[PDB]
PDB file of C-alpha atoms and ligand atoms in Angstrom:
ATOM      1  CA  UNK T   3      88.008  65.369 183.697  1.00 40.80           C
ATOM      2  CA  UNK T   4      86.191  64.402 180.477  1.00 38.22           C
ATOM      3  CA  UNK T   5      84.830  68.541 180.180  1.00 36.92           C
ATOM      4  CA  UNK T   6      88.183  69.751 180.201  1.00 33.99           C
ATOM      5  CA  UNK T   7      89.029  67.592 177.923  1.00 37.16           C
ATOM      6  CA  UNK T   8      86.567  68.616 175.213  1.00 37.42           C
ATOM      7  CA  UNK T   9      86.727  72.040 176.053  1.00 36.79           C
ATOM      8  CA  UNK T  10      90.818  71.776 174.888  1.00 32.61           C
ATOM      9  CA  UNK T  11      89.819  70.309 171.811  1.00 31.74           C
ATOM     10  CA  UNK T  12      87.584  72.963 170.857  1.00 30.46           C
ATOM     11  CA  UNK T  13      90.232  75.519 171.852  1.00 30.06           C
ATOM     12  CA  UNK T  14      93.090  74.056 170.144  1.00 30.44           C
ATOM     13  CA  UNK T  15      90.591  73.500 166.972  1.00 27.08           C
ATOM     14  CA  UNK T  16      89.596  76.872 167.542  1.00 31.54           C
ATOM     15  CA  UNK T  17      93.029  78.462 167.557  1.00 27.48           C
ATOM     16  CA  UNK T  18      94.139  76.378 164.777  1.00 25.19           C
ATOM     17  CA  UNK T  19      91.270  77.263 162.472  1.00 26.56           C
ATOM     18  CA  UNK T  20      92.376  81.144 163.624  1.00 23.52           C
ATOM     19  CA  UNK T  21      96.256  80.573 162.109  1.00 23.15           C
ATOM     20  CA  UNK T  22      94.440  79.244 158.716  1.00 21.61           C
ATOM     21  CA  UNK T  23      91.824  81.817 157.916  1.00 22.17           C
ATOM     22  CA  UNK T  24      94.747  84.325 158.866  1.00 20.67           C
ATOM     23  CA  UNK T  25      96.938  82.729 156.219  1.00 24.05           C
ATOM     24  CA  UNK T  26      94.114  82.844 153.585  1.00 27.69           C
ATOM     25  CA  UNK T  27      93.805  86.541 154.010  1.00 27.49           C
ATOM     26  CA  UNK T  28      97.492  87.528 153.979  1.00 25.19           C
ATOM     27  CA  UNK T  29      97.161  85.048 150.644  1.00 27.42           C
ATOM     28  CA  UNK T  30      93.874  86.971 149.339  1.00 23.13           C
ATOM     29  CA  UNK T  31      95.438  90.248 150.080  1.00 21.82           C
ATOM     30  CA  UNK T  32      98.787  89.409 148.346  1.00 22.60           C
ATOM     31  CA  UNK T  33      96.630  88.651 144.802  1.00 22.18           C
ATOM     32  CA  UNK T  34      94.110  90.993 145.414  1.00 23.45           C
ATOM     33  CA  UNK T  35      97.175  93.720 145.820  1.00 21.35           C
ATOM     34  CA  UNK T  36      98.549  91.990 142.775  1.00 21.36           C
ATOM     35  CA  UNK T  37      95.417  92.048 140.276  1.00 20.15           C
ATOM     36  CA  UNK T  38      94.393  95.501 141.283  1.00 18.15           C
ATOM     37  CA  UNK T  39      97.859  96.603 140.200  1.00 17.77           C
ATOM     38  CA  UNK T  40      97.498  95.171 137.265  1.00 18.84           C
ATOM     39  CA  UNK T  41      93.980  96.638 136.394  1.00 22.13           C
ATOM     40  CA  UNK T  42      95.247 100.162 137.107  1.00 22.38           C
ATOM     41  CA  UNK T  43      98.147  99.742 134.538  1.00 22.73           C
ATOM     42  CA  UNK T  44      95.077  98.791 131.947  1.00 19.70           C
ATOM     43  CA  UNK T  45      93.115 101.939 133.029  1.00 16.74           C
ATOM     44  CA  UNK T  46      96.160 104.264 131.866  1.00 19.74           C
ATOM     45  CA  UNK T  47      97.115 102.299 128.888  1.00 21.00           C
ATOM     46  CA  UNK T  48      93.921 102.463 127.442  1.00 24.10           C
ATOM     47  CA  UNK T  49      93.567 106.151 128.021  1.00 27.31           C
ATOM     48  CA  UNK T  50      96.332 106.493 126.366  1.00 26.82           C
ATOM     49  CA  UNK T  51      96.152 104.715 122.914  1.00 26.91           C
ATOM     50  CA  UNK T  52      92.263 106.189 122.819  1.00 25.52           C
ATOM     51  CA  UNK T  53      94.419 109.515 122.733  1.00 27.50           C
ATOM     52  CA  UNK T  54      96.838 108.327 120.723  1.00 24.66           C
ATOM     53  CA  UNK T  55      94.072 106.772 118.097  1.00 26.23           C
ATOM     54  CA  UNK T  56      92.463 109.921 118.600  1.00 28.51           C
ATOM     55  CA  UNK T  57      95.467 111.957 117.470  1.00 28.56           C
ATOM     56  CA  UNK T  58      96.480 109.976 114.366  1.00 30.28           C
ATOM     57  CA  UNK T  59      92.988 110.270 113.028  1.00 32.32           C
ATOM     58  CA  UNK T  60      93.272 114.193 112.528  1.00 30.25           C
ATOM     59  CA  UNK T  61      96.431 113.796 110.726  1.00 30.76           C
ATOM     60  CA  UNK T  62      96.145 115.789 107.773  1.00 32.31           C
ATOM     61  CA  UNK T  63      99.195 117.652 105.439  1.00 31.94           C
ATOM     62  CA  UNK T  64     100.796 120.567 106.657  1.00 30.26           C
ATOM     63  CA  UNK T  65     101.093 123.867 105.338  1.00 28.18           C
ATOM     64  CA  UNK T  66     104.929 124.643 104.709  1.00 25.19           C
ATOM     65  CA  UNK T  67     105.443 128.128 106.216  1.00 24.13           C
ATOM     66  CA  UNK T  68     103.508 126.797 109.469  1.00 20.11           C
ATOM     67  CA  UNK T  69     106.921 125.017 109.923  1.00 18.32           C
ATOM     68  CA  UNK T  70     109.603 126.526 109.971  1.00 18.91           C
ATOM     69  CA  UNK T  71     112.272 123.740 111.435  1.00 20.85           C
ATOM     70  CA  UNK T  72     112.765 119.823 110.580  1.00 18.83           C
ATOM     71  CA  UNK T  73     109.930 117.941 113.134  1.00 20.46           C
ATOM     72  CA  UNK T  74     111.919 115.671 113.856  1.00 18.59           C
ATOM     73  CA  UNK T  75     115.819 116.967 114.673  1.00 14.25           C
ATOM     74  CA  UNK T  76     114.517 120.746 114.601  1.00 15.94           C
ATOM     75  CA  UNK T  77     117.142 121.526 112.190  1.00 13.58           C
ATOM     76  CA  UNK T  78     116.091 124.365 110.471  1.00 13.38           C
ATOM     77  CA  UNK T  79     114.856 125.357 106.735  1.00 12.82           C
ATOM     78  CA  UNK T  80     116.276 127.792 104.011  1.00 10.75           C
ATOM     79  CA  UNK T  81     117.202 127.210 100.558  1.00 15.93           C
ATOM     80  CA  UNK T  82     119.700 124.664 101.086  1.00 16.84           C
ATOM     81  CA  UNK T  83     117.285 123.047 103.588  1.00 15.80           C
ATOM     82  CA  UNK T  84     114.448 122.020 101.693  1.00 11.33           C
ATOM     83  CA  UNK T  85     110.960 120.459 102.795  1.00  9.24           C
ATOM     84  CA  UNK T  86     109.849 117.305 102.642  1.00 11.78           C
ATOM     85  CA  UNK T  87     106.529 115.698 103.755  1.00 11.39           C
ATOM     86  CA  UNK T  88     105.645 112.269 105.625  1.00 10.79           C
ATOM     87  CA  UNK T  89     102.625 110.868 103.463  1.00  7.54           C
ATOM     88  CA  UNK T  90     101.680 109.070 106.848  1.00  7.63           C
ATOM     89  CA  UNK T  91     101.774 111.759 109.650  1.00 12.52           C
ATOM     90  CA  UNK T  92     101.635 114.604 106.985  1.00 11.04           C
ATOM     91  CA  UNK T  93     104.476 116.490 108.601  1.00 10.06           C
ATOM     92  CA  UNK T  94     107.236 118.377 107.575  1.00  8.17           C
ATOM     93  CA  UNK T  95     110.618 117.011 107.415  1.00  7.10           C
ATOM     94  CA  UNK T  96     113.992 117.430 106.281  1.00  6.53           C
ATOM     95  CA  UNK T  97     115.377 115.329 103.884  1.00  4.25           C
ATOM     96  CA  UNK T  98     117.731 113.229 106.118  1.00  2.00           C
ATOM     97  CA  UNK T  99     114.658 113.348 109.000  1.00  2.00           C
ATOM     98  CA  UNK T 100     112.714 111.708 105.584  1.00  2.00           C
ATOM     99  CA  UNK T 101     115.117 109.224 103.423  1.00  2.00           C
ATOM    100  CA  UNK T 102     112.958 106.375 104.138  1.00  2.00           C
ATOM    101  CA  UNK T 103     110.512 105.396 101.603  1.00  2.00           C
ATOM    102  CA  UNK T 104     107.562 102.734 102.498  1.00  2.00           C
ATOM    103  CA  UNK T 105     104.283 101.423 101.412  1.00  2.00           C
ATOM    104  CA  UNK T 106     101.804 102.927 102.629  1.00  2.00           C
ATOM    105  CA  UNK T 107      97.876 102.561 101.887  1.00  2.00           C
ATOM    106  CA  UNK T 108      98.345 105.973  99.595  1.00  2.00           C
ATOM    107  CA  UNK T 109      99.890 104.636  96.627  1.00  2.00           C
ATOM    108  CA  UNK T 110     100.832 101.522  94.851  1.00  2.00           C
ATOM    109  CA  UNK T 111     104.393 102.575  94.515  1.00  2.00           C
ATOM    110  CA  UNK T 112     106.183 103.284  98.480  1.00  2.00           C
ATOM    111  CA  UNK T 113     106.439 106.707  99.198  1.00  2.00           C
ATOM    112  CA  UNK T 114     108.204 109.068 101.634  1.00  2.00           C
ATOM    113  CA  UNK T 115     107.895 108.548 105.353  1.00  2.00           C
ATOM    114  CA  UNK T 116     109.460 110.076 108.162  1.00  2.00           C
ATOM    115  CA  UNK T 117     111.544 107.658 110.386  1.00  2.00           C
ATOM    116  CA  UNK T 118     108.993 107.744 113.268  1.00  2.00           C
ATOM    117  CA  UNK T 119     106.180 106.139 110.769  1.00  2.00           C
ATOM    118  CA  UNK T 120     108.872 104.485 109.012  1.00  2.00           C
ATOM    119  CA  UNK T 121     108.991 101.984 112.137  1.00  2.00           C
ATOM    120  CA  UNK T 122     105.356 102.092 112.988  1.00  2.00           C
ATOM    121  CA  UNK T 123     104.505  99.917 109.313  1.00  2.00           C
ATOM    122  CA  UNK T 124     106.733  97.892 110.972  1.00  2.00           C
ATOM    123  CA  UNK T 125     108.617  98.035 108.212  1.00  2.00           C
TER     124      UNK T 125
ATOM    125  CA  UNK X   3      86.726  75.235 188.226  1.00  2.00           C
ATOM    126  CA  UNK X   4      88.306  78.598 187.642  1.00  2.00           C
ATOM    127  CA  UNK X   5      90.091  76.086 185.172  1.00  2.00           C
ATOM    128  CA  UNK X   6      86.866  75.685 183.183  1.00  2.00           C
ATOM    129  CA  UNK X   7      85.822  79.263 183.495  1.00  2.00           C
ATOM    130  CA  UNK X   8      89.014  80.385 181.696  1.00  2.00           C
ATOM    131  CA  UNK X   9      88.487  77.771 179.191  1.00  2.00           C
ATOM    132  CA  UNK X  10      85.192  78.418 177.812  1.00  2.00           C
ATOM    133  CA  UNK X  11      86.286  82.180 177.454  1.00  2.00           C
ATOM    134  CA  UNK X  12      89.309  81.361 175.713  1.00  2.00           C
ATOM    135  CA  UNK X  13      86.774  79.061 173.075  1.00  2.00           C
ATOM    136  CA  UNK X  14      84.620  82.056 172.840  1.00  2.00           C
ATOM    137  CA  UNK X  15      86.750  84.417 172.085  1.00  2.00           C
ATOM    138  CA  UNK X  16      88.123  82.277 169.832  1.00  2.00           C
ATOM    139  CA  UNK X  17      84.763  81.450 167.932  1.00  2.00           C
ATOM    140  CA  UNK X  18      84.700  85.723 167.986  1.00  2.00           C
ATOM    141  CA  UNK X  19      87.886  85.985 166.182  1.00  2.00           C
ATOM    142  CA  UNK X  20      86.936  82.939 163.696  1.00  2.00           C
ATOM    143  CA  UNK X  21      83.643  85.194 162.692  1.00  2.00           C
ATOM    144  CA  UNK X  22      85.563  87.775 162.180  1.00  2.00           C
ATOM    145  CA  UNK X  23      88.349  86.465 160.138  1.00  2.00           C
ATOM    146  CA  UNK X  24      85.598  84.389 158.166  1.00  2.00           C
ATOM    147  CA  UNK X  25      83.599  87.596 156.426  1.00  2.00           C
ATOM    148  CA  UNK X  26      87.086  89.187 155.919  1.00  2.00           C
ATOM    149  CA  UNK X  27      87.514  86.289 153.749  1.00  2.00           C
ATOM    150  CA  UNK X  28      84.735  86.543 151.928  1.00  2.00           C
ATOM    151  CA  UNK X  29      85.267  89.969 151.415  1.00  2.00           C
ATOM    152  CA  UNK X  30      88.592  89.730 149.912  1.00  3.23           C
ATOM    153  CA  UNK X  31      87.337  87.145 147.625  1.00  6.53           C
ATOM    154  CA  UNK X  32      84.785  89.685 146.170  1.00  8.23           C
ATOM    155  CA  UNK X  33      86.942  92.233 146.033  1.00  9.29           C
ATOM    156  CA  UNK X  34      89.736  89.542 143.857  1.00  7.93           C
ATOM    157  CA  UNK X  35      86.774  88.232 141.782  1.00  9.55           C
ATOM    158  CA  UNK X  36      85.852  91.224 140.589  1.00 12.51           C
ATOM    159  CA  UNK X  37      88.805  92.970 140.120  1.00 10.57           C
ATOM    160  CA  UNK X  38      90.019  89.965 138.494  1.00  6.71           C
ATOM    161  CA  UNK X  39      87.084  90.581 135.800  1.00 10.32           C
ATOM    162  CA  UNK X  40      87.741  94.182 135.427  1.00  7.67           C
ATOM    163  CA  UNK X  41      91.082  92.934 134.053  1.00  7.07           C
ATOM    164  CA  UNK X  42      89.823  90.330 132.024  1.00  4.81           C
ATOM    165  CA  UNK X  43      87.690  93.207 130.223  1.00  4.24           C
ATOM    166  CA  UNK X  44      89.663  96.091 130.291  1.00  3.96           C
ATOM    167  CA  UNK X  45      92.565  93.588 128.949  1.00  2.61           C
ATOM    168  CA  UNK X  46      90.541  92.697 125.652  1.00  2.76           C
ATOM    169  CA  UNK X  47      89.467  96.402 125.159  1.00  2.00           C
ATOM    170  CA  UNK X  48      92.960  97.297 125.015  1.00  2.00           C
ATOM    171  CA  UNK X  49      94.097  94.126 122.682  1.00  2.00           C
ATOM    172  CA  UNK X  50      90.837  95.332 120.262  1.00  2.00           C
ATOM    173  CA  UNK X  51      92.600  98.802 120.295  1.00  2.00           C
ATOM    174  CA  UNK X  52      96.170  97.426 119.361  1.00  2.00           C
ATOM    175  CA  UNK X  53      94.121  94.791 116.541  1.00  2.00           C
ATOM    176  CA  UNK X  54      92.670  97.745 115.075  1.00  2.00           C
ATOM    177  CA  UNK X  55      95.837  99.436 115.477  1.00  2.00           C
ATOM    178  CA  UNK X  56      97.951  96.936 114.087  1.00  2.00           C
ATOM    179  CA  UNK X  57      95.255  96.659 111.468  1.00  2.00           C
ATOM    180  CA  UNK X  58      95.776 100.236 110.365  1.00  2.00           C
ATOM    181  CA  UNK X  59      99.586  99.920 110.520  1.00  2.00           C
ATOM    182  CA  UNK X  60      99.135  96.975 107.918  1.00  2.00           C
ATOM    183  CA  UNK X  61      97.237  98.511 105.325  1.00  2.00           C
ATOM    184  CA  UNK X  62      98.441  98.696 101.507  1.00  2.00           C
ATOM    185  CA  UNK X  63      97.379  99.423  98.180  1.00  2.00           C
ATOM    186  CA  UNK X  64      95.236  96.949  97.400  1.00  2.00           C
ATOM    187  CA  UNK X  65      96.319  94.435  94.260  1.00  2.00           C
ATOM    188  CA  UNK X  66      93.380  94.465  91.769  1.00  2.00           C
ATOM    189  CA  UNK X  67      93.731  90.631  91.319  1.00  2.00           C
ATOM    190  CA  UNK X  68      93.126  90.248  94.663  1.00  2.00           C
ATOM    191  CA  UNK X  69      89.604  91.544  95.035  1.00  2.00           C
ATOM    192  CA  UNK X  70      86.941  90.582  92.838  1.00  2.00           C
ATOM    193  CA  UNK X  71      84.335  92.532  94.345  1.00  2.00           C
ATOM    194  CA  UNK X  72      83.318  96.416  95.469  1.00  2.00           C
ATOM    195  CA  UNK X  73      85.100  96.292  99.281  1.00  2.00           C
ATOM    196  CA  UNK X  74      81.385  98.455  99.898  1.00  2.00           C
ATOM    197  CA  UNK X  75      78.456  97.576  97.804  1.00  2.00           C
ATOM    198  CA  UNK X  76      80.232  93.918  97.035  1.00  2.00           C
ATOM    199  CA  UNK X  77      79.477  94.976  92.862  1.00  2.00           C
ATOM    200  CA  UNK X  78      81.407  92.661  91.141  1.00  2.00           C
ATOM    201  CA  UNK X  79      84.054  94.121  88.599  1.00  2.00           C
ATOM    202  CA  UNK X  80      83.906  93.788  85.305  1.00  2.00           C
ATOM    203  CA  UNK X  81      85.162  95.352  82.049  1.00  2.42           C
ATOM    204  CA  UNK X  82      82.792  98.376  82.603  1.00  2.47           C
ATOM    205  CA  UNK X  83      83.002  98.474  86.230  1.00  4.66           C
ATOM    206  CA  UNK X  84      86.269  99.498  87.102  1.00  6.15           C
ATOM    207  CA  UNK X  85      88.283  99.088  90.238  1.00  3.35           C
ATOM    208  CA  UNK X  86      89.731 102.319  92.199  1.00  2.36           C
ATOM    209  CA  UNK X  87      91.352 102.390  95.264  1.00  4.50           C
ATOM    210  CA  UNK X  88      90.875 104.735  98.467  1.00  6.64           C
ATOM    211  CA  UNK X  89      93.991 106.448  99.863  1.00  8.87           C
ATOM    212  CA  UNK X  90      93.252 106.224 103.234  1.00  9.98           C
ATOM    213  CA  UNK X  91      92.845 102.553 103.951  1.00  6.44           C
ATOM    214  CA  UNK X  92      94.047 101.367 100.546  1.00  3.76           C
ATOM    215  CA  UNK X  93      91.147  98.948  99.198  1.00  2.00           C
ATOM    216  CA  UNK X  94      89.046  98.918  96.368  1.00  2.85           C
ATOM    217  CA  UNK X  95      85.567 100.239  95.300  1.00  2.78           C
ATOM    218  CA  UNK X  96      83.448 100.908  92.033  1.00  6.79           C
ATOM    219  CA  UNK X  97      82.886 104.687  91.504  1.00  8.41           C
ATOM    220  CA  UNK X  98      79.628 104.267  92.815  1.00  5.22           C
ATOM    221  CA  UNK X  99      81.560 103.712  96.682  1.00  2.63           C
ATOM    222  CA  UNK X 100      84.144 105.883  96.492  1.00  2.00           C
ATOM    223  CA  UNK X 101      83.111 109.023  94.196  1.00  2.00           C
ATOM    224  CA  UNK X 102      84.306 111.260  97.008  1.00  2.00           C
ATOM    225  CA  UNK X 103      87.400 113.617  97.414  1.00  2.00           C
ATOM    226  CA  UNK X 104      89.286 114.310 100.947  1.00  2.00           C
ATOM    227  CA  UNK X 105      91.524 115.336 102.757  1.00  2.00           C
ATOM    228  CA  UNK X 106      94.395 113.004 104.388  1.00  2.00           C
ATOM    229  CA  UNK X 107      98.332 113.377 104.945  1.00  2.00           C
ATOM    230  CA  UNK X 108      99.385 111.769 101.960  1.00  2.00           C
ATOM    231  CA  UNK X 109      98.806 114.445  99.645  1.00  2.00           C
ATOM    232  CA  UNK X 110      98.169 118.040  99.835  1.00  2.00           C
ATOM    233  CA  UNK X 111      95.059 117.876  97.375  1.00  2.00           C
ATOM    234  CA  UNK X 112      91.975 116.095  98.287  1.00  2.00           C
ATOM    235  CA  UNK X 113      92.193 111.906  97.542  1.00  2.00           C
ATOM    236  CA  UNK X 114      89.535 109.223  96.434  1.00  2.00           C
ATOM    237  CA  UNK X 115      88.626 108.268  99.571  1.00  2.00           C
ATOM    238  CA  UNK X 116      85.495 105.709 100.119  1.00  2.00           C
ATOM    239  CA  UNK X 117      82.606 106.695 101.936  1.00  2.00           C
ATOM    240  CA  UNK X 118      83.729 105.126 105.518  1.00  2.00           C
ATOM    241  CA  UNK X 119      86.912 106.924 105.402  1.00  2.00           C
ATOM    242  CA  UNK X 120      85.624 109.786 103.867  1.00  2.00           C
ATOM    243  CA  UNK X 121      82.465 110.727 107.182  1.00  2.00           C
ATOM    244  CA  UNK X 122      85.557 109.056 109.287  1.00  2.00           C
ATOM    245  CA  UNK X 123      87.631 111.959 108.570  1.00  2.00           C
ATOM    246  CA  UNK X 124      84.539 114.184 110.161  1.00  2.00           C
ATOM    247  CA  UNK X 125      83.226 114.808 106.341  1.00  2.00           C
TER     248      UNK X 125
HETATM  249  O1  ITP K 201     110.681 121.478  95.526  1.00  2.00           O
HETATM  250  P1  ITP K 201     110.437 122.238  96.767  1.00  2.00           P
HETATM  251  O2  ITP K 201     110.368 123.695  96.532  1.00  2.00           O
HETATM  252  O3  ITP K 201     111.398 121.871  97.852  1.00  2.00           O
HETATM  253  O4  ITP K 201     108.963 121.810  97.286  1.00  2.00           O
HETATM  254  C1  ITP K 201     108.744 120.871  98.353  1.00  2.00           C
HETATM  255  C2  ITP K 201     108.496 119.498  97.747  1.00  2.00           C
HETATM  256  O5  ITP K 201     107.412 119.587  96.803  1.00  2.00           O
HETATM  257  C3  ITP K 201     108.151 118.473  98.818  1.00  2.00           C
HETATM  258  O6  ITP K 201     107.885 117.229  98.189  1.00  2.00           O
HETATM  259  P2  ITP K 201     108.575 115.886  98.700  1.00  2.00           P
HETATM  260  O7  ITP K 201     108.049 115.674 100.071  1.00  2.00           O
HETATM  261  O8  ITP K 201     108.152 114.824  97.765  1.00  2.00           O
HETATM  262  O9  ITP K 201     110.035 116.115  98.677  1.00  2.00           O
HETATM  263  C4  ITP K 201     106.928 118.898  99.622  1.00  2.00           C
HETATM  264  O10 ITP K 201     106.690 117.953 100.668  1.00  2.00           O
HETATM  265  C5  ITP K 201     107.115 120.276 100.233  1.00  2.00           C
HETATM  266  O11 ITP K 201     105.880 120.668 100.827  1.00  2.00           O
HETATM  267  C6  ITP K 201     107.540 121.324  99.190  1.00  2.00           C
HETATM  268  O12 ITP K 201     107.872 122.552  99.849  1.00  2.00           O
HETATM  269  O1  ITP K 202      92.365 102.975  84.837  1.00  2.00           O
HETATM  270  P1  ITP K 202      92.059 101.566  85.219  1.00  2.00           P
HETATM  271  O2  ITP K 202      92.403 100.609  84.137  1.00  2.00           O
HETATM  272  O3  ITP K 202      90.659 101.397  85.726  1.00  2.00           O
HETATM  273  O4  ITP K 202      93.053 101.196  86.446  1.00  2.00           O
HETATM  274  C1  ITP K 202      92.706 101.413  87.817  1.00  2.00           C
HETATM  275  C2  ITP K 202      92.805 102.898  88.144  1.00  2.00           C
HETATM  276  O5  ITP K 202      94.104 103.383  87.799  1.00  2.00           O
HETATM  277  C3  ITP K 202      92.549 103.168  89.622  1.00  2.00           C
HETATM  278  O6  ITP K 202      92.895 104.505  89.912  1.00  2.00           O
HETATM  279  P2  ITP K 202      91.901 105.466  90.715  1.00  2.00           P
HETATM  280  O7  ITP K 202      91.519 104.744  91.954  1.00  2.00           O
HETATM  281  O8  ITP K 202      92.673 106.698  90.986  1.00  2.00           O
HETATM  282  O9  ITP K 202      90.740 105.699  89.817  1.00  2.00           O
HETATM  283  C4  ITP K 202      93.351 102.267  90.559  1.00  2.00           C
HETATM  284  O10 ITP K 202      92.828 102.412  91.880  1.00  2.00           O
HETATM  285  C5  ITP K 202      93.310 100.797  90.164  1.00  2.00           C
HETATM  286  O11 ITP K 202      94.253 100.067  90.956  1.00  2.00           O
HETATM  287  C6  ITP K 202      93.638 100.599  88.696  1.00  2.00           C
HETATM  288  O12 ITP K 202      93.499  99.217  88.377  1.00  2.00           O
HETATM  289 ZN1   ZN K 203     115.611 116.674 110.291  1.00  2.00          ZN
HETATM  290 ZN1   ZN K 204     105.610 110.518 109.729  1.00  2.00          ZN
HETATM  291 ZN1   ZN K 205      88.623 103.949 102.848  1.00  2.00          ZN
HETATM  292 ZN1   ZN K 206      80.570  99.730  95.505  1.00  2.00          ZN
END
């Protein structure tokens, strides 16, 4: 009478604390899926501006006959198409790849950049 | 009676399950706490990376009026100590911090570069 009674209660308690915990772990899993996404996206990106760091640091000015076409739209170079050089990647450019000048930590007066570097000053 | 047999089972069974869903809990909440402080550190590695790189992509030539002292040593200028700029990161320095030559992509010749810059471009 009175056992069954109690017995109900701790079932129904039971099976009711069952449909919460469930709900907290389809909740956990959600934000754990969503956080772990998000820390994988910071794993590549900083792997890939170390590189990127990495590969503006041995920047240095490039011999002309190493390069034989613009860097930039591969046109190529003759006597009509002259060189140019980016004083902040230290490539080699054609003049229309190159008719941006900018100021630069090089000299007082701004000096010629290629568009790419042109935009990475921000200005 | 078969009524109470059935009952207690279903409660046990029930207190199983609970146990079960309970560490599962716990685990997940590891698992989001500390994932959600791998982001948290991986996030301000990557924000020091784009600071420093933003840093870099900010850099000019120095004006003289605005620094009074040797960017290195702190040697204050004067009429005999001159000012002279680095090409690489554009600040100033006496002689004394910047009496070395090398090469960067803003010239094809070695440049004044300070002592920092100059071991930071591997000597
Ligand atoms: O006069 P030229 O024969 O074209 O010589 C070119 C100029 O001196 C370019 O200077 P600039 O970048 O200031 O144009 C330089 O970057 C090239 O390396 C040279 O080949
Ligand atoms: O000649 P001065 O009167 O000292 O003038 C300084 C020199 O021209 C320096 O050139 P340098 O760095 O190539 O020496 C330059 O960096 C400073 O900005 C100038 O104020
Ligand atoms: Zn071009
Ligand atoms: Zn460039
Ligand atoms: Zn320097
Ligand atoms: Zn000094």
């Amino acid at each position: 009478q009175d056992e069954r009674r109690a017995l109900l209660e701790r079932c129904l308690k039971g099976e009711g604390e069952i449909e919460k915990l469930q709900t907290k772990v389809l909740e956990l899993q959600r934000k754990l899926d969503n956080t772990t996404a998000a820390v994988q996206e910071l794993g590549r990106e900083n792997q890939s501006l170390q590189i990127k760091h990495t590969q503006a640091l041995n920047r240095k000015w490039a011999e002309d006959n190493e390069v034989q076409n613009c860097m930039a739209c591969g046109k190529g170079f003759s006597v009509t198409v002259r060189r140019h050089h980016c004083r902040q990647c230290g490539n080699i450019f054609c003049a229309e790849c190159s008719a941006k000048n900018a100021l630069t930590p090089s000299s007082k007066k701004p000096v010629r950049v290629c568009d790419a570097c042109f935009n990475d000053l921000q200005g």
